[PDB]
Amino acid sequence: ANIVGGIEYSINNASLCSVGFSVTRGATKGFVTAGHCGTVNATARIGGAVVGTFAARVFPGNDRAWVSLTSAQTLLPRVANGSSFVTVRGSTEAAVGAAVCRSGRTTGYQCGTITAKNVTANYAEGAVRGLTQGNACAGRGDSGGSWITSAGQAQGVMSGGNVQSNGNNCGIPASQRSSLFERLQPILSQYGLSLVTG
Template structure:
């Protein structure tokens, strides 16, 4: 696969990146040092910003998000019901038509559409207020197809693949190439992929990159010399920690806040420059500091963290970061594999990422993504195309996209319980 630019550092840009890793500031639950200013009481500051974006009142914005979350909860109930039915089905019936749901996403009408392969599954979906559709593949088949495509890309020797991932709304696997003239290996790969049913190939107009820069959404100053944004505070074995983008804490750097006060130190990362990676990591918060159960959304308010999830594709999501503040959009994909390019021509294949239409820039890396008050993930990277998100533009920072590490996966892997507000 071809390289995406690595995340951009807040103070220096990593050259040669196709995808940008970690965008500067992360939106984590604020961490307070003994000498820092008091942290304001948490309020749900997400709704006024979204209301301005959508042209509605904060109360109406809250109603829309609440409706999304009710449907997401209904989806969980429907999945349990269909899974139970699948366990009780006879082997012959299970082979003919699966009674389970097979992926879900919000459409433009804000309906939660679920993929089904049987009349029984469709009935369960409708009973839970969901919108069923029958598809040729579905999430499980797409996941298998994605693995096949990734194997073909690896075997081809092409270095021009930016990303490979499933797209639930189209029921297809999307392969994106980096811009520029295609090599002979890439041409051969494209010809082979075009013959695979359910696969689309397109070429991006820009490269990708990563970024670096601990109060949630505030600067994560790394020593030496780079910066990210803070992610989500939590506990592990009784110890205060913070979940972050792995590339932010690669090498276990010491972490400071904007005043130069020490917050903690990186203790774990699954990101290894130049090697197959997952962009999740962990910072130990010093005993003199406190991890909070809310994030600083950079507009004078904070947003409580009341839980965590992988919201359905199409869900509204916002992120707080040190470089661009509060920007919003929608979830578009899960389980993407992207290639981040770095200094010296290194390529870091990074798997397990989600993609959204949220605008980010260098220094936002590690920052917190949240849907209402439900934690979603930490900024990983985005396009290296010189775009300008502006500051605190909410959903008006359009025309870009970003990748993030789902917080549910990181918390599960490291055994972290998120701190709630």
């Protein structure tokens, strides 16, 4: 499969998540995603075909994971935006107030601004600390998807937020949204990964 930020993948033929970013670890291809999407060794599928397995994850506490893929996968330095693409250029972290977009299989590509950093989410499973908060909306299924600036600087992967009864936070005003993402920087150094860029 072509690996692009924001596309859907399933875990052990049950849950759905979105791809964060294409990465490499020496000769191994992978993608970074949310830790809550799977457990180590869980199987990831793209369009019904097995593409790899969870190699590592941390959740709760943090919310990160990387899936090592088979040799046959095509890693691309891109994030889905409808039928178009946003080129990944690096991972400079943006500051509070910067505009940012996120891409995922449930709400598509949504944009907004970063509102706060170092936020704690108290999920049923335990707290997740150090999340960055933006006001782009998102829905169930968007987890693990890419957070990126229009200039192509990757910021992190979708963790969670204040989902409403309709499964997303898109029918409430930006001012009331809490959409949280795990910072990419610490995931790259923790697993020794390099971002694929173009």
